[PDB]
Subunit: 389 residues, 4 copies
């Protein structure tokens, strides 16, 4: 048992294989399944787990009514064995609140949750199942974090947090933890103008976080973090293949150093990419407008070339089915010479897109890279909304 | 691996951070959640667990009818992983009965339950999951104990017990256990006139128990225990800030050595305080009359100064919501140089305050100290009683 | 870690303290609780567990209809953590069948289940969770065994089994196992005329089995086993205090060497006693006729004195409540210089005594000896049959 | 802990003892039990587990409607403790998809699942709970595998897979894995004309797979694999006792090297045999037309003699009850000098044979060899379909 070091490069990825699916809404139609949203996965030396923010109610429960609402005192980060659906019986409460991240440093798991009212939220930082550090809101406006896993190197686990407006300049910080204790705090530097919901992964001693600009950009901000020097830079994804939602049509050229405006009607969604020269993959919703469908696009030099476009594609969720947030994770403890990219897609069901029920929840699908050329189908949620009416 | 020794001082506390919330009533509206009351938490080298007295029925079950009643042969002390709701599937039966305490001595857990008829109750003392000692009623009138954790030092774990009237002088004893075996029994001495439901914690080699005087005082009794000499003293919290329920208005001065009487309509509720000079915090219900709301008040020198008043406050449960019992615990095994105060509030739902249902149950919230100035919100139970009608 | 040796004497017993109660029928009115009967408890170095024969249906399930029937292909021996109720989610399947015993030898657990048709049943003998031995019926008429725990000494676990009529002479054998393998088989010898459902315990290198004579006696047969020599003797309890059900009134004198006959309308019930000279306790139903109530009677010299009567009594279940089978077990791994007697009472609900429901099931209560004089109350099942109508 | 090798002979078998039965459909009438089909068992050093393909819904759930369908994105291979019924709360997701195999090599478990559309399926090969290898469809027509356990020798675990028509010549391959990595791929050789759903076991350093010819043969193909040389041969079972369903009446002679045509209306079912000279047992449905009943027949020299007929029988499921798939497994880690044959029968309930419900699911029974002459009875599912109407 030892601290994870980010000593490996990313594996070559030519297609995506199925890792896990929990079928939570199908199962939750009859079994005692918690209402969730903002799911993710995170691994440790022993295996991988599913994570999400509970709403503190089952899906068929009367208290599912009103679960469109993002923030309440009844939310908590919960984790469970990958592939099961989240029930009150198989879930571990990681921390209490309505925004989270989690990661394993090789020794123990750090989990962070924000809670409180909009103007006075706070984070509690847990390590090894115990509370270590507390962080008060610095801007008084929904202190919040990644909603997917953080990444650790030599015990140092950077986390990106934001406090301030969703629709204007906000105060983003990079906090570097070790065993749950703050080693350093940096204010966001560089050319990213707005940061939400970073999706992060590590390779070759570098952590890259692909985020959501909720203010201006339909191109995604990219934060590049050195966990040894505990320093960073920021800019935007260069590619013309825009990957936030909502977004306009892809332009003839991207923009590395400024947000590309447009899209309607949504200011953003959490998403991700793996950036590795030729071996670069962008996720996005198939719909330009709404959280519908999900596709993976291989976009060589997306990080550096404004003219970069796709050379291959894999549909993950067809555009007749609802998607949601998406994020990066890696099983850093696999028995491989390279770190293999993985991602999840949150499959949102109910409100607001499906108004015939009173609730909002999700299920999860996760995939990882293959070097092979694998066939694919749509991994949509699979529940029949009419059964809940 | 070794006995806990209470070597460390209390941590400085300037505000309270969220630790856990189980949302039991919300979840139990649909899932199979046991009816409980008199909850608490207690930790050990590996972590913390929730505890409560089951009523031997689920909340939606027909047997939840009648659960306002305190004592039956169907009650048991159960424990479960912190943050989960208590189901028939995830709970450990610690012992059988209708009054309890539990604590870990660093080696194993001691749990104690009283059971039987009012005039012929008995305690069974468990250690490491096995029954060790039994104690018959000495006064033939509801032998009973703390309803929150005990505290251990060098393997010696004092427990405060009462047998006798709830509304007149009773027979309290302090029993000092080691590995579940009685080392010494003392009769209550000093100026406290009636003792119930002690909330106890340890720091700097001293155990302090903040109790309920059900006979006279709206100020709370304090028993100070030397766990090495196995002796004690008792008196009242000195502060004018009265912290029982029901209580009168706070007087000009409190009284260290006698009860401050008054209030209506109820003679008491279990509560707690942390007493450490300037670093002193008193919990109480927001209402003077009813078990509604919950507030933490920083009252420097509350233990010693009859003129001591609050210098800061944090609302835990707003006064539009039901509270209940409250009690102390500490994660004595944290990786900190001090022992950090924690507490829980029982959030009672149903009878008698909510008579539209046939049951009485609760959920739990728990918080611990922070040296930071954290923002706060209300951690009320969150269930809609109309859903249960 | 080491084979159990039955070195220790029995502890002095002056009253009985509560050990466990599962409240299964109360809980199972709403939660998913298996239908059972023929429960018992059995301990091991780590803890104690509850055992019973499942009916392969939940209590509220439609397949609970018809569960008065004793033998089907849908029964199995299940175990679970002591104090929980048996659900499909918390139970281990020990073996498949409709008659059972189980014991731990200090290293691993031996479990035995008989299954098959009446004329051609077979036992499968499991050790450490694997099947070791199979035993075909020797008399073609419901091969069957203890329905409570067996006892082990230096790795040898004797088990009493019967094959043959329930209402005439049958063929009983004592089979001596080690690691699930047959070391020796003996035909029953001595003065017991019929043997069913032995309740066995060890002390001072001797195993005593207190059984049910279903053919003649309302006095209980006693088999005394030497597990080192692998030999035995049999006779009847001497005491005039008759402990089977149905039974006649206690006569002036019992009979050590022949059945005391009579009683109406039923030929027997599984029960138990602890026999240790002056330190002897007999359990029985309070009703002479029906499986109603339960009482413990201290009967000095019950094993040797035909005139021995009770000097003490403790009501375990009041005579307004249903009881059932009862049996012996001991935590042989307690940290005590003596082995402390324990017993359970099966609390049968439903048919045939409560014919307003279509099912038969039970809950469990268990108690162990105290040297103190503890108060007592009735530990009846506690479910309202009306809720099941 | 070492790699398993197969250098023990098969135990002598004269009858079959009950190993496990989950009663899933009875329990699932009113507990949260997943809809499954294609079950099996597989063992490891610690014990044995049940496996099946979930349909990603509970049995009583509305999504159970339409579970006759074999392939969907909502299916997964799940495993659970032997004898329990499969719930969302007690099941481990081994991999995602709609055809599987699994086996333990002595060190870790390999699990394989195929998923995707009919024309573009792919296998993901897991080892020790992590994805190792992916395999694309080679024939574009439902890449698929055994639906019962594989077998490992000195690290090498062969797996039989088919891709191609169910009703014409297909492309079968034997893939040899070590720690989930491909060691070798072979195309099917020999005289078997079509291969589905192989049931495999090892003995004497050889793996024998008894399979389903879905194209022509009512006699079952037999593939003999040497896991050291990593080569194989194939032919048909010689015996005149035909063991596929549907099948004609048994002829006066079998055929070792060609399919025997006939039977109506169905082309095949997964089944199994143990082939060991005089010690040979064949399973089959009792009905020659339908998946009803199940019988074991001892057919000396079934593998080599076209005139070989039964010398003994045991009815496992009576012919008034539904059966289904059946397959081989062995506890290779038992404490015996020989490998004892075990098998399971899938007990299918619902569609198409029971059209009064909207679903298709199963329960499991499993039996192992005995050298004794044990009595038998029918181990049918035991649910009443009307309870589901
Ligand atoms: C088994 O399953 C596997 C796994 O899924 C399947 O393999 C897959 O096979 C397909 C072909 O069948 C390959 O498709 C290739 O994808 C790339 C990239 O495509 C993405 O980007 C395109 C451009 O997008 C930008 O630009 C457009 C405007 O131009 C904007 O609208 C966009 O917003 C972007 O800004 C885009 O058009 C593609 O859309 C398609 O996919 C999406 C999902 O992402 C769908 O929703 C759409 O409906 C649509 O289908 C996509 O987003 C293309 O570049 C490839 O085109 C080349 O190849 C074609 C032949 O395959 C050929 O007709 C084209 O003219 C073009 O040819 C050029 O390049 C070839 C090399 O690729 C040369 O050979 C050729 O000579 C020439 O120079 C192609 O469309 C998948 O990548 C592949 N995936 C994997 C993971 O292997 C397989 O099909 C399955 N088999 C069966 C039997 O089902
Ligand atoms: C207590 O338990 C023990 C142990 O379980 C049990 O022991 C069994 O005892 C019986 C004797 O009572 C044994 O039965 C023997 O079985 C031999 C094989 O029988 C099978 O094969 C027969 C031939 O099948 C082929 O040929 C026919 C055409 O001829 C064709 O239809 C078939 O398809 C196939 O090609 C078959 O007829 C027979 O069918 C019976 O069983 C099936 C289920 O398998 C059932 O569906 C049928 O309705 C029918 O019952 C069977 O499938 C058989 O050869 C053997 O008979 C020879 O010896 C007997 C002596 O008893 C002579 O009378 C006779 O002339 C034969 O030469 C005999 O019938 C069985 O093997 C024991 N099993 C074991 C596991 O030990 C006891 O019976 C139980 N006791 C009680 C009280 O119940
Ligand atoms: C982010 O959240 C922070 C954490 O909660 C919050 O920081 C808080 O800031 C407030 C506002 O500045 C501070 O308030 C200060 O509190 C002290 C102490 O107040 C308490 O005691 C007094 C006196 O009570 C006694 O006397 C009266 C009779 O005069 C009796 O009625 C009473 O029984 C006692 O005998 C009391 O008057 C106060 O009453 C307030 O609070 C209670 C709840 O506890 C309410 O029910 C009541 O209606 C009223 O609101 C109180 O009980 C006071 O002396 C100061 O003058 C000042 O009010 C908090 O202490 C401070 N807390 C912490 C932990 O830092 C931030 O404000 C917040 N930020 C934003 C933007 O929201
Ligand atoms: C706190 O709880 C304590 C624990 O329960 C309790 O202490 C108990 O106190 C009582 C009252 O002092 C003591 O009772 C004594 O018991 C002995 C033994 O009595 C038992 O056996 C006799 C004889 O039965 C045989 O002979 C008769 C002939 O008539 C036959 O019927 C019978 O079949 C036998 O052949 C029997 O008469 C007694 O009957 C009583 O109890 C049964 C239940 O067991 C009832 O069903 C029945 O109606 C009747 O009440 C009994 O079975 C007796 O000889 C003494 O004279 C005296 O009765 C308990 O022994 C004692 N127990 C212990 C464990 O210490 C405290 O009383 C309680 N305190 C308070 C305040 O409640
Ligand atoms: C990751 O790196 C840290 C730092 O290199 C490792 O901790 C080291 O422990 C080994 C023990 O021999 C030494 O090689 C290093 O000098 C240690 N360095 C420090 C500063 O502690 C950790 O072991 C590494 N993890 C892995 C998997 O190799
Ligand atoms: C869903 O939640 C809404 C919001 O609470 C419920 O609307 C309330 O219904 C109650 C009882 O009828 C009324 O007293 C309130 O006036 C309503 N509140 C609001 C804000 O409308 C609604 O009933 C819930 N739906 C269901 C089916 O439970
Ligand atoms: C309980 O089980 C009994 C026995 O199976 C059921 O009674 C049978 O019902 C069938 C079908 O309607 C009748 O034709 C049989 O003749 C009945 N048998 C007997 C012995 O009465 C009964 O319906 C079941 N009850 C419930 C509520 O499920
Ligand atoms: C097959 O596995 C068995 C069991 O591990 C191996 O058994 C050992 O055989 C050697 C001689 O080759 C003995 O010295 C060991 O004591 C045996 N161990 C046991 C537990 O029996 C055997 O070697 C293996 N054979 C191969 C070819 O791998
Ligand atoms: C079971 O599923 C079937 C198949 O989806 C349902 O039948 C369909 O109902 C839809 C919606 O009303 C109709 O438009 C179609 O005509 C039906 N399709 C088919 C193939 O029949 C059926 O209603 C479902 N039953 C239940 C009780 O859920
Ligand atoms: C039990 O008996 C053995 C003899 O078989 C003896 O050596 C040992 O001391 C005893 N074991 C224990 C646990 O006392
Ligand atoms: Ca945006
Ligand atoms: Ca009071
Ligand atoms: Ca009798
Ligand atoms: Ca065929």
């Amino acid at each position: 048992r030892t601290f994870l070091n980010l000593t490996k490069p990313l594996c070559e990825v030519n297609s995506w294989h199925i890792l896990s699916k929990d079928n939570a809404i199908r199962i939750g139609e009859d079994a005692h399944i918690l209402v969730t949203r903002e799911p993710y996965l995170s691994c440790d030396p022993q295996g991988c787990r599913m994570f999400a923010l509970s709403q503190g109610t089952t899906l068929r429960g009367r208290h599912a009514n009103g679960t469109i609402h993002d923030r309440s005192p009844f939310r908590a980060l919960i984790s469970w064995e990958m592939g099961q659906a989240p029930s009150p019986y198989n879930t571990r409460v990681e921390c209490i609140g309505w925004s989270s991240t989690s990661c394993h440093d090789g020794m123990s798991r750090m989990s962070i949750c924000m809670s409180g009212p909009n103007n006075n939220a706070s984070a509690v930082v847990w390590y090894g199942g115990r509370p270590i550090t507390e962080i008060p809101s610095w801007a008084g406006n929904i202190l919040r974090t990644q909603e997917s896993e953080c990444v650790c190197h030599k015990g140092v686990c950077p986390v990106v947090m934001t406090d301030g407006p969703a629709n204007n300049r906000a105060a983003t910080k990079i906090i570097y933890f070790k065993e749950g204790k703050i080693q350093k705090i940096e204010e966001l530097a560089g050319n990213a103008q707005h940061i939400e919901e970073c999706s992060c992964y590590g390779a070759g001693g570098v952590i890259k976080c692909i985020c959501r600009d909720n203010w201006k950009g339909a191109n995604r901000p990219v934060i590049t973090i050195d966990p040894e020097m505990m320093t960073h830079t920021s800019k935007y994804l260069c590619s013309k293949v825009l990957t936030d939602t909502s977004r306009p049509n892809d332009p003839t050229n991207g923009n590395c150093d400024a947000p590309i405006t447009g899209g309607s009607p949504d200011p953003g969604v959490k998403g991700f990419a793996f950036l590795d020269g030729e071996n670069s993959w962008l996720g996005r919703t198939i719909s330009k407008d709404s959280r519908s469908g999900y596709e993976m696009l291989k976009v060589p030099n997306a990080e550096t070339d404004i003219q970069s476009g796709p050379i291959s594609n894999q549909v993950i969720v067809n555009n007749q089915n609802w998607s949601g947030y998406s994020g990066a994770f890696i099983d850093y403890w696999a028995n491989k010479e390279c770190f293999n990219p993985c991602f999840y897609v949150e499959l949102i069901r109910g409100r607001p897109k499906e108004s015939s029920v009173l609730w909002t929840s999700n299920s999860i699908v996760a995939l990882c890279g293959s070097k092979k050329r694998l066939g694919s189908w749509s991994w949509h949620d699979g529940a029949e909304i009419i059964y809940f009416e």
